[PDB]
Amino acid sequence: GNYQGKKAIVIGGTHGMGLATVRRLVEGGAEVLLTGRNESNIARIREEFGPRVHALRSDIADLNEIAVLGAAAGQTLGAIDLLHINAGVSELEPFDQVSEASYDRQFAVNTKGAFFTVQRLTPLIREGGSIVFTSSVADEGGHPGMSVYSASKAALVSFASVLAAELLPRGIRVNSVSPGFIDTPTEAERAEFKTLGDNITPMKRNGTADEVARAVLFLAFEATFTTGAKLAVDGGLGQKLS
Amino acid sequence: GNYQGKKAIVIGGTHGMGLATVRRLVEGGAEVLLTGRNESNIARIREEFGPRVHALRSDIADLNEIAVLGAAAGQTLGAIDLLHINAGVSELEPFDQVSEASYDRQFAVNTKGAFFTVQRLTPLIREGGSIVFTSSVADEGGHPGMSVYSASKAALVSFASVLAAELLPRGIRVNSVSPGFIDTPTKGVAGITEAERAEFKTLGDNITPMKRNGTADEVARAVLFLAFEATFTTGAKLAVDGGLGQKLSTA
Amino acid sequence: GNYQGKKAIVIGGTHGMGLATVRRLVEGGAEVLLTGRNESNIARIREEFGPRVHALRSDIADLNEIAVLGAAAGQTLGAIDLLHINAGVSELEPFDQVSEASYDRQFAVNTKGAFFTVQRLTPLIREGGSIVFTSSVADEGGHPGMSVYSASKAALVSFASVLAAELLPRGIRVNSVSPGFIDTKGVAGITEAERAEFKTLGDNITPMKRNGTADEVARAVLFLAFEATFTTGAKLAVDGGLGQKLS
Amino acid sequence: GNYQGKKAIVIGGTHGMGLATVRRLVEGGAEVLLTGRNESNIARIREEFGPRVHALRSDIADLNEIAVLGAAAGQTLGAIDLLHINAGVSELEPFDQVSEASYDRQFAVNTKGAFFTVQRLTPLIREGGSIVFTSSVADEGGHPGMSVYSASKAALVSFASVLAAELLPRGIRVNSVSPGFIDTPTKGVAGITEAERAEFKTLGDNITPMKRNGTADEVARAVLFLAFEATFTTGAKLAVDGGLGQKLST
Ligand SMILES: NC(=O)c1ccc[n+]([C@@H]2O[C@H](COP(=O)([O-])OP(=O)(O)OC[C@H]3O[C@@H](n4cnc5c(N)ncnc54)[C@H](OP(=O)(O)O)[C@@H]3O)[C@@H](O)[C@H]2O)c1
Ligand SMILES: NC(=O)c1ccc[n+]([C@@H]2O[C@H](COP(=O)([O-])OP(=O)(O)OC[C@H]3O[C@@H](n4cnc5c(N)ncnc54)[C@H](OP(=O)(O)O)[C@@H]3O)[C@@H](O)[C@H]2O)c1
Ligand SMILES: NC(=O)c1ccc[n+]([C@@H]2O[C@H](COP(=O)([O-])OP(=O)(O)OC[C@H]3O[C@@H](n4cnc5c(N)ncnc54)[C@H](OP(=O)(O)O)[C@@H]3O)[C@@H](O)[C@H]2O)c1
Ligand SMILES: NC(=O)c1ccc[n+]([C@@H]2O[C@H](COP(=O)([O-])OP(=O)(O)OC[C@H]3O[C@@H](n4cnc5c(N)ncnc54)[C@H](OP(=O)(O)O)[C@@H]3O)[C@@H](O)[C@H]2O)c1
Structure with missing residues (x-):
């Protein structure tokens, strides 16, 4: 009865890392509210789980949607122990090929959408609770073709730090996981990507969504003297190993 | 110490650190073009310097103006050794006070405009040349009331890194300076106001390990070292912060 | 059965966070060999834990004794899943007062002894096993009075990185915990009077405004040891934010 | 004229980047005392500079010799504006092959010797002066064959931090430079052997993002910038590494 009586919101929990995090929460006995954008993913969840989990379709980028999301969460959960921010999008292109539209899209979801979602949902967080952000190994260093994604994630990591400072009086810890290549789901080059992660990750494999899930829930419930910190789940990729 | 035959663009060079940088560039013999958003600041620049430097009123946040700026630079300088991105704005707000408008304003100038300005001007940059970003000690760690500003600067540092990586085949270095409470207007x-700035300066005197604010010229010297002397340096950061971001357990 | 069948070595597991790590290990079903120096501490732990622990009086700074621990560990445990390096000493003094003797004592234990202890015991570590080092929030930045201690832990953190790289083909992960003020x-x-004054300092400079518990560090060591299977060369702060630049 | 009237001690300035720093100091009008362990290299320094520089055989690893150097520095320079700790050694060994002797030799020069040299000479540094340490890109991250050297430099960087904090009230700044595969003898x-240096050199050209080794002068320029121009900089690190330590995924 580990997560018994605990309540969590996972933003972007219909899929991959978020969903793996949802599975551990539910099997640990927690009550979970999760969001996603895609109709198909929500449909699957609503069938597989039932009313021990609340699947809400909600665009992280829409501030009006965020306000309604906060009203519903407060109604359903009342108050929570964990807010997990997981939603993220990426468009790989060389720096001089970035258009204003592609630039805006990625920052809308990855940075601004996350900030205002956090701003709306933070008053529901109980003392002793926490926020865990899903970042990326890309949040430090220079990776060609990821100028916008890497930068949107670096900003998110900065938000976690200031949120960790400003939320001290409320006894809410704020931390980030930094995943490398994680094997989860355009297929034929989604495939080419997983190979890259195999070649270049020092541990020579992709991570599992459950490995990220484990790191998220550790920071949430066990790292009770940890705030403003970052935790690598990258097979050594961000750790300067030759 | 001599920039004879060098040409440089300073985005946000109408006062403070950027202007201090302009002054050393000019005093060393550089050909310089600078921008600013405020019009009377531009007038003062034209009076101090005369026709010696090219000063353009140009909003960094505006993509049409960035295009106009690009053509102007290509027309007046043709090809450059240094692009200094200095422009910045900041609005102090506790995190639950931040509005969409104030959020958008700071990212528009400090992050998006810097990205697209660099995108438009990078073709002018010659082999051996460099881009120097002005970041902030706030680009790392948690400073209350500066959530948006810190994040917009953290984003800029990331861009500096990816640019350093992508511009390697062009032999263009990309680095960042990180101030620092800097005594500036x-x-x-x-x-x-003036009152709330004099207090911000004093906060600087108290919490800076070196017990003072930096000067604009100290920042300028660091920008120009990175631009012209640090020829084996790229993707790096140089602190000009009196120790503030260096984890010195005083006081 | 959480750590059922598991075998671990905790270097300096006689007190505090090393002892809290031993406890969580034994409670989850692991067999542990630990080392230390204090007679009463070692006797007490033998008494408390019976056949689940092997407690050895072993000076981490003494290379002759490290060789004996290697024979003993290999004889008593054979193959292991976790090597936890926790042992450390601190001598607080301004830089201009550090003697050669005081400098040597801290490095002998915190760094060299750690290095040669890891060198000697690494061959026992199973594939899929790991090493965890106890560092300190002092391993980065500048803290007056702690020049030697800070540098010694900074060297340890470096060792952890190079080991994480050298041990990739064995499938052995190498990570570090960086504790702040722990009560x-x-x-x-x-000693126990000096510990009190320091605790008090930690209460009012730590951003979370309290010291951490030994169990909090132990939980982080054992997460890295057994749960962070895609984590190596990494550092994990248990410092109430002290190391994370929060104003 | 830019270092006119300044006095500097370079610890390890008989060749390589230490010598590049000395040469830049002397062109700028500085008075310089430098050290090295190799008496033949010291003879070569006196052949080049004659008496415009003070050159002393002084083993950084020996505390007795450090004490002697402290007296000699006092007598010769009186007070100084720059202390540059550059001396170093490295021995490349897989971790499982490191012997007590090889470990001791590297920490004795790189860490302990550096510490007690700074401790003995700090009283000579005057108002507004500084200390600069030469670290390495190896002081962060994991590089096989370099467990001892990397840890010894990682330790040096921590010393720089604590010293920057403890030397604040004396108005003395302390910073480090971090090369970089650098082309030195x-x-x-x-x-x-020279076969292994050539390979080390080639390795440098391949893994370094800027795809070349750095020059000794490039490091010298960064040391002297930190020494004299970075007057609001302390406890900091400056990369001279062609991007190697900056996580460029090239
Ligand atoms: N993939 C990697 O290897 C990797 C590496 C580093 C970091 N990360 C980070 O890890 C996080 C999660 O990755 P993943 O494994 O879940 O793969 P992913 O394809 O990044 O999934 C992102 C998640 O966010 C949801 N989402 C996207 N836009 C949304 C919006 N506007 N509103 C609400 N939800 C939205 C998606 O749900 P729907 O598809 O149902 O809308 C999906 O659940 C991302 O933030 C990413 O930046 C991933
Ligand atoms: N001052 C400090 O202590 C401090 C500390 C850390 C970081 N920084 C950063 O260092 C940089 C310089 O700051 P500062 O205090 O010297 O002056 P500042 O008030 O940040 O202004 C910097 C320059 O940017 C220009 N600028 C502002 N908005 C612009 C826009 N929309 N388009 C084009 N240019 C624009 C300003 O010109 P106009 O006003 O004429 O438009 C000015 O010349 C900034 O990025 C700042 O955030 C400063
Ligand atoms: N507690 C804090 O506030 C704090 C703050 C910063 C860093 N740390 C670090 O966290 C780690 C644990 O700290 P701690 O406070 O528990 O240290 P501690 O109170 O001194 O206990 C350390 C443990 O290591 C053992 N040990 C000490 N010297 C040894 C030697 N020469 N050979 C073998 N074993 C030896 C001790 O055994 P005996 O009991 O038999 O002597 C003890 O069990 C240390 O490495 C320390 O550097 C702690
Ligand atoms: N070269 C590189 O690629 C590289 C890269 C990263 C870091 N580093 C570091 O940068 C620094 C300079 O390296 P380098 O390649 O120019 O030369 P180096 O071979 O490391 O030697 C530098 C200086 O240290 C002196 N030295 C060595 N042992 C000494 C002792 N016991 N007492 C006093 N002086 C001693 C040498 O003088 P004598 O030989 O005349 O005794 C030499 O002048 C070193 O600290 C090195 O570890 C070098």
Whole structure:
């Protein structure tokens, strides 16, 4: 009865890392509210789980949607122990090929959408609770073709730090996981990507969504003297190993 | 110490650190073009310097103006050794006070405009040349009331890294300076008054390990070292912060 | 059965966070060999834990004794899943007062002894096993009075990185915990008075405004040891934010 | 004229980047005292500079010799504006092959010797002066064959931090430079063959993002910038590494 009586919101929990995090929460006995954008993913969840989990379709980028999301969460959960921010999008292109539209899209979801979602949902967080952000190994260093994604994630990591400072009086810890290549789901080059992660990750494999899930829930419930910190789940990729 | 035959663009060079940088560039023999958003600041620049430097009123946040700026630079300088991105704005707000408008404003100038300005001007940059970003000690760690500003600067540092990686085949270095409470007429924050700046400066004196504010010239020296002397340096950061971001357990 | 069948070595597991790590190990079903120096501590732990622990009096700074621990560990445990290096000493003094003797004591234990202990015991570590080092928030930045201690832990963190790289082909992960102020009944002594004054300092400079518990560090060591299977060369702060630049 | 009237001590300035720093100091009008362990290299320094520089055989690893150097520095320079700790050794060994002797030799020069040299000479540094340490890109991250050297430099960088904090009230700044595969006669590893240095050099050209080794002068320029121009900089690190330590995924 580990997560018994605990309540969590996972933003972007219909899929991959978020969903793996949802599975551990539910099997640990927690009550979970999760969001996603895609109709198909929500449909699957609503069938597989039932009313021990609340699947809400909600665009992280829409501030009006965020306000309604906060009203519903407060109604359903009342108050929570964990807010997990997981939603993220990426468009790989060389720096001089970035258009204003592609630039805006990625920052809308990855940075601004996350900030205002956090701003709306933070008053529901109980003392002793926490926020865990899903970042990326890309949040430090220079990776060609990821100028916008890497930068949107670096900003998110900065938000976690200031949120960790400003939320001290409320006894809410704020931390980030930094995943490398994680094997989860355009297929034929989604495939080419997983190979890259195999070649270049020092541990020579992709991570599992459950490995990220484990790191998220550790920071949430066990790292009770940890705030403003970052935790690598990258097979050594961000750790300067030759 | 001599920039004879060099040409440089300073985005946000109308006062403070950027202007200090302009001054050393000119005094060393550089051909310089600078921008600013405020019009009377531009007038003062044209008076101090005369036809010696090219000063353009140009909003960094505006993509049409960035295009106009690009053509102007290509027309007046043709090809450059240094692009200094210095422009910044900041609005101090506790995290639950931040509005969409104030959020958008700071990212528009500090992050998006810097990205697209660099995108438009990078073709002018010659082999051996460099881009220097002005970041902030706030680009790392948690400073209350500076959530948006810190994040917009953290984003800029990331861009500096990816640019350093992508521009390697062009032999263009990309680095960042990180101040630092710097004694300047805006203090980095335009909205506040003279009263609230004098207090911001004093906060600087108290919490800076070296017990003082930096000068604009100290920042300028670091920008120009990175631009012209640090020829084996790229993707790096150089602190000009009196120790503030260096984890010195005083006081 | 959480750590059922598991085998671990905790270097300096006689007190505090090393001892809290031993406890969580034994409670989850692991067999542990630990080392230390204090007679009463070692005797007490033998008494408490019986056949689940092997407690050895072994000076981490003594290379002759490291060789004996290697024979003993290999004889008593054979193959292991976790090597936890926790042992450390601190001597607080301004830089201009550090003696050669005081400098040597801290490095002998915190760094060299750690290095040669890891060198000697690494061959026992199973594939899929790991090493965890106890560092300190002092391993980065500048803290007056702690020049030697800070440098010694900074060297340890470096060792951890190079080991994480060299041990990739064995499938052995190498990570570090970086504790801040951690609190340590009811016994008298001059150590225990010095511990009190330091605890008090930690209460009011740590951003979370309290010391951490030994169990909090132990939980982080054992997460890295057994749960962070895609984590190596990494550092994990248990410092109430002290190391994370929060104003 | 830019270092006119200044006095500097370079610890390890008989060749390589230490010598590049000395040469830049002397062109700028500085008065310089430099050290090295190799008496033949010291003879070569006196051949080049004559008496415009003070050159002393002084083993950084020996505390007795450090004490002697402290007296000699006092007598010769009186007070100084720059202390540059550059001396170093490296021995490349897989971790499982490191012997007590090889470990001791590297920490004795790189860490302990550096510490007690700074401790003995700090009283000579005057108002507004500084200390600069030469670290390495190896002081962060994991590089096989370099467990001892990397840890010894990682330790040096921590010393710089604490010293920057403890020396604040004396108005003395303390910073480090971090090369970088640098083209020096030893490549920082004095004990290997020239076949292995050439390979080390080639490795440098391949893994370095800027795809070349750095020059000794490039490091010298960064040391002297920190020494004299970075007057609001302390406890900081400056990369001179062609991007190697900056996580460029090229
Ligand atoms: N993939 C990697 O290897 C990797 C590496 C580093 C970091 N990360 C980070 O890890 C996070 C999660 O990755 P993943 O494994 O879940 O793969 P992913 O394809 O990044 O999934 C992102 C998640 O966010 C949801 N989402 C996207 N836009 C949304 C919006 N506007 N509103 C609400 N939800 C939205 C998606 O749900 P729907 O698809 O149902 O809308 C999906 O659940 C991302 O933030 C990413 O930046 C991933
Ligand atoms: N001052 C500090 O202590 C401090 C500390 C850390 C970081 N920084 C950063 O260092 C940089 C320089 O700051 P500062 O205090 O010297 O002056 P500042 O008030 O940040 O202004 C910097 C320059 O940017 C220009 N600028 C502002 N908005 C612009 C826009 N929309 N388009 C084009 N240019 C624009 C300003 O010109 P106009 O006003 O004429 O438009 C000015 O010349 C800033 O990025 C700041 O955030 C400053
Ligand atoms: N507690 C804090 O506030 C704090 C703050 C910063 C860093 N740390 C670090 O966290 C780690 C644990 O700290 P701690 O406070 O528990 O240290 P501690 O109170 O001194 O205890 C350390 C443990 O290591 C053992 N040990 C000490 N010297 C040894 C030697 N020469 N050979 C073998 N074993 C030896 C001790 O055994 P005996 O009991 O038999 O002597 C003890 O069990 C240390 O490495 C320390 O550097 C702690
Ligand atoms: N070269 C590189 O690629 C590289 C890269 C990263 C870091 N580094 C570091 O940068 C620094 C300079 O390296 P380098 O390649 O120019 O030369 P180096 O072979 O490391 O030697 C530098 C200086 O240290 C002196 N030295 C060595 N042992 C000494 C002792 N016991 N006492 C006093 N002086 C001693 C040498 O003088 P004598 O030989 O005349 O005794 C030489 O002048 C070193 O600290 C090195 O570890 C070098």
